[PDB]
Amino acid sequence: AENFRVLVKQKKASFEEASNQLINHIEQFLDTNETPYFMKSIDCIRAFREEAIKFSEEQRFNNFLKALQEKVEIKQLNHFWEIVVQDGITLITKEEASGSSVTAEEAKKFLADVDDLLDMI
Amino acid sequence: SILASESLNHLLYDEFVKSVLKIVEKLDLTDPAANLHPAKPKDFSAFINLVEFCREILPEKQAEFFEPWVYSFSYELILQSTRLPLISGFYKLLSITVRNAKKIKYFEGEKYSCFALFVKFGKEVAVKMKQYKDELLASCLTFLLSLPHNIIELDVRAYVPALQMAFKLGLSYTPLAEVGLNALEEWSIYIDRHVMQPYYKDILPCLDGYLKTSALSDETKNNWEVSALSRAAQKGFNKVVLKHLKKTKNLSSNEAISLEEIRIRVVQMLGSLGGQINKNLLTVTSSDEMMKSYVAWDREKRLSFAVPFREMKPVIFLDVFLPRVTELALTASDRQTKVAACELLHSMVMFMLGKATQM
């Protein structure tokens, strides 16, 4: 699931039917505590970020970042937050819209009797 | 033919022979017929499987495929058999070798080396056979009588006691009787009709035991009792009967040879053997041994046994069955006759002892 997963990521029929599936994949990869799974998940989110930027998918991008942030806050995982903040991935930061040239600030602003039975034996 | 094949048969045969030779070369053959097996146990099993497989694979397509292999095969087998004479299974391979080697002529005396090899080995084994037992002896007889002997006519006196031994070991092991018959046929036609002549009086009297059934052997039903083919036939001549006939035609009857087939072949041999030679089953027409056969074993009637009835108790004499009972027990040629004859002979001897010294 290294190159075939990437080819799944690059394109499909619609902009769905592989989104939620890979959401489950990264969720179960986060469930197991092996770091390479976390690296695979960060690669997946990087690919999703570039694909959303290059395919006008800001809605999916921001919804996914908010959902994953809430989920990882809910569950007892820290090292995933460690690597994410070491990289920095959050919602769009330019103008809350498609395209602009504003430096990233939204990510920065959002992420700094019976008992007798026993003894009568 | 559909698959486009020029000489694949030749290569497969050659590789089969090479594989067999390699297996025999490293097998450590040091069940055994005399209280001895200081050898690897799983080697004889392998050897036996290979030997039977060879006998049921090698003889077919015996053609020029096997011709370049005879000398090498026979030489390896004869070496490793000379070093291991108690094997019972080098002789089977020798039998197959010689049968294939005389199916193609290969014998009119290179080739002469193989011929001298078999002359020596055949005489050697024909002398060593005199010390062997049932399976080893049967294999040795099979090999010996499988020798060409159309060309090995040399000292047939050495091979006659083998042939007749085979005839004795028939009546209980049919394949060996078949081998004896085939060998006698080959010797009669191909050997010169002047050196065989003094030996017929020795050979044929061994055949007599095969003519001892008088149409009383009805042990099994001599007709169809019930078959699915019979059931189908009883309701008409149609497709189901055709199917039952088509499946039963290719029964592949590999049961070796029935005893009645052997008896028929014995009669055909006797007839085909002439009328001069033919008379040699019997004795020699009022010599000493005939007139010794006309005298009762004992002149005075003993074993007077009174059969118990309700009122009489008449006396018969058991001393009149003893001859026929003994020749029956020895050479019954029928298992169910033989067991009854042996039982009666046991009882007779025991009666003999009892009357020898009773009250």
Binding site: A1, T32, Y37, K40, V114 | D28, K42, P68
Partner: protein, 654 residues
């Protein structure tokens, strides 16, 4: 003389033996080894009626035996100048090396020094062939390297296993490079992992590197969880092949490090595609000996289960449920005291904990921990004698400090009380984790069965522990064991040559009960077990426990599933309920006749119930009682009302 001069000089059985003797003489004359190697690697191509030759490959293929004998007579030279030409003639060099290797392997009986010398000499020159397994090398060459190495370290042993005894750094670098590449695919990596039983026996620092590269293999080459690609596709076939390779390698070398990978991948799926092979492998692992490494295996899987490891509860349960349990059962030892005493002290402590119902996640983790610990205790007690837990043995000696006045009955009651507390627990106010706590109660009762089956086989502790309930405070037993909501379906009807083939392998380098819906209730089998036990332990009725079952069974207010489960138990234990049959009519016949039996009036339990109830005829006399008579008549009327069932066989059966 074998070269055409005009298609091809055909050999024979004698034409080849002559040449064999001839060149055996030629080698007998003098050294001639350098010349022999020289024209053995000669690249002059031949052709026949196509070309596909090198006249050295043909030359070697013809003889290959006297050539190898001469090449082994003076091994050190021939090997050196053979690997001298590794780069330009890799095919023929590899073929000759394999030929000498398996020639020596054939001759490992008379000698042992020669194969070792050959292996050490090849390793001494392992640098000479680095282009073979380097990057950009053809994949066929890499497989050639793998097969060559497999032969090299299969002939004698992994004598290059420790402290760089041989050219260990080169071997290990080659092996890790082969396993670590990304362009390469799953089956070559499978034949690579076939060579693990030789490298999973070395100390840490490099075993860490092997573990890390194995983890990188498991990731990025295996399904997300499992069975995400369907059977038939090359992905599925390759994944299955790699799994079989891993499992046979693991069953060959009882290496703890492979457990934390095999069980790790097994137990993130609800049930794996090829799980039965996992359990067969584990059974093979445990049931052969070397008690210390068995303890190591148990400890490894136990550490996986016990450690914090924030993850799914289902995965943690699966750890013990599949891997550890099948390890414990099959064969560990009758004296495997190490894990035994290691777990006694800490299992009970976890059992003596308090359910922190604040977060569902931590509560689920606690339930799973207790369930696993106490299934472990179940298997402990089941496969273990009685004295070594009650007598003057290491029971008091380990649960308390040293020998104690009490004999062995401290841990017994210490766990039994909490057993009974767990499975006789009120559930009225709890509605958050139903199935999980149900499994906890079930396993509670299972190991209760196993323990009390070994408490000095006393006549009556079974009634007071297994069967005694306190309904006045909603302290029940079977209302906890049974789900009481899953409607059951109940369908209507359903020597020398062994050595030779081993040499060929080296050269090629290739070679009770019905589980329907209800007997699978994780308490059914042990229940029948202790019932058949305590019947065969020592006629109004047996003291109080069949009275308990009778009251729970012969009562149409006890909810349906308890009655069904008890009826199935009676069916499976009719052998022991037979001499008390006269009481088991109103319950059994009442259940069969009752039209509230489930579904359409299920026609499977009725079949077995009637077969059992009619088994003891001449006994139990279904007449003489008006309720019994009316129940029988109801049964008969209903039974003939439903006979047809268009299938002919079942109609005849009815």
């Amino acid at each position: 003389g074998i070269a055409p001069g005009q298609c091809l000089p055909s050999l024979d059985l004698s034409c080849k033996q002559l040449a064999s003797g001839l060149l055996e003489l030629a080698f007998a004359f003098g050294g001639l080894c350098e010349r022999l190697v020289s024209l053995l690697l000669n690249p002059a191509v031949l052709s026949t009626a196509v070309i596909h030759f090198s006249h050295g490959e043909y030359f070697y293929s013809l003889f290959s035996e006297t050539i190898n004998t001469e090449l082994l007579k003076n091994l050190d030279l021939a090997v050196l100048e053979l690997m001298q030409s590794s780069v330009d003639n890799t095919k023929m060099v590899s073929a000759v090396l394999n030929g000498m290797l398996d020639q020596s392997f054939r001759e490992r009986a008379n000698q042992k020094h020669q194969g070792l010398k050959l292996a050490t000499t090849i390793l001494q020159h392992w640098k000479k062939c680095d282009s073979w397994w380097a990057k950009d090398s053809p994949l066929e060459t890499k497989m050639a390297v793998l097969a060559l190495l497999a032969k090299i370290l299969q002939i004698d042993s992994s004598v290059s296993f420790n402290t760089s005894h041989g050219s260990f750094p080169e071997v290990f670098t080659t092996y890790i490079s082969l396993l670590a590449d990304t362009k390469l695919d799953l089956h070559l990596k499978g034949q690579a992992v076939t060579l693990l039983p030789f490298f999973t026996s070395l100390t840490g620092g490099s075993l860490e590197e092997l573990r890390r590269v194995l983890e990188q293999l498991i990731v990025a080459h295996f399904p997300m969880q499992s069975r995400e690609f369907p059977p038939g596709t090359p992905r599925f076939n390759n994944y299955v092949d790699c799994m079989k390779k891993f499992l046979d390698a693991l069953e060959l070398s009882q290496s703890p490090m492979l457990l934390e990978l095999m069980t790790e991948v097994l137990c993130r799926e609800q049930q794996h595609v090829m799980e039965e092979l996992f359990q067969s492998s584990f059974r093979r692992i445990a049931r052969r000996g070397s008690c210390v490494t068995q303890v190591g295996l148990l400890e490894s899987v136990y550490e996986m289960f016990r450690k914090d490891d924030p993850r799914l509860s289902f995965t943690r349960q699966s750890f013990v449920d599949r891997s550890l349990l099948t390890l414990l059962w099959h064969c560990s030892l009758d004296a495997l005291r190490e894990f035994f005493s290691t777990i006694v002290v800490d299992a009970i402590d976890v059992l003596k904990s308090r359910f922190t119902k604040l977060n569902e996640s931590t509560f689920d983790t606690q339930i799973t921990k207790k369930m696993g610990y106490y299934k472990i205790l179940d298997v402990m007690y089941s496969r273990l004698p009685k004295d070594d837990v009650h007598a003057k043995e290491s029971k008091i000696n380990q649960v308390f400090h040293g020998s104690c006045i009490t004999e062995g009955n401290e841990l017994t009651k210490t766990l039994i009380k909490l057993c009974y507390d767990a499975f006789t627990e009120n559930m009225a106010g709890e509605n958050q984790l139903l199935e999980r706590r149900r499994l906890y109660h079930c396993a509670a009762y299972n190991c209760a069965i196993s323990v009390i089956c070994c408490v000095f086989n006393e006549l009556k502790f079974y009634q007071g522990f297994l069967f005694s309930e306190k309904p006045e405070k909603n302290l029940l037993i079977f209302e906890n064991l049974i789900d009481l909501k899953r409607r059951y379906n109940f369908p209507v009807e359903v020597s020398t040559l062994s050595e030779e083939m081993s040499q060929f392998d080296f050269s090629t380098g290739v070679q009770e009960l019905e589980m329907d819906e209800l007997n699978r209730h994780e308490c059914m089998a042990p229940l029948t077990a202790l019932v058949k036990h305590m019947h065969r332990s020592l006629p109004r009725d047996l003291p109080s426990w069949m009275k308990f079952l009778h009251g729970k069974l012969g009562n149409p207010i006890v909810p349906l599933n308890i009655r069904l489960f008890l009826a199935k138990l009676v069916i499976n234990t009719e052998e022991v309920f037979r001499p008390y049959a006269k009481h088991w009519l109103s319950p059994l016949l009442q259940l069969a006749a009752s039209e509230n039996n489930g579904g359409e009036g299920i026609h499977y339990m009725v079949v077995e119930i009637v077969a059992t109830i009619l088994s003891w005829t001449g006994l139990a006399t279904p007449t003489g009682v008006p309720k019994d008579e009316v129940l029988a008549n109801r049964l008969l009327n209903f039974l003939m009302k439903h006979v047809f069932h268009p299938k002919r066989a079942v109609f005849r059966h009815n």
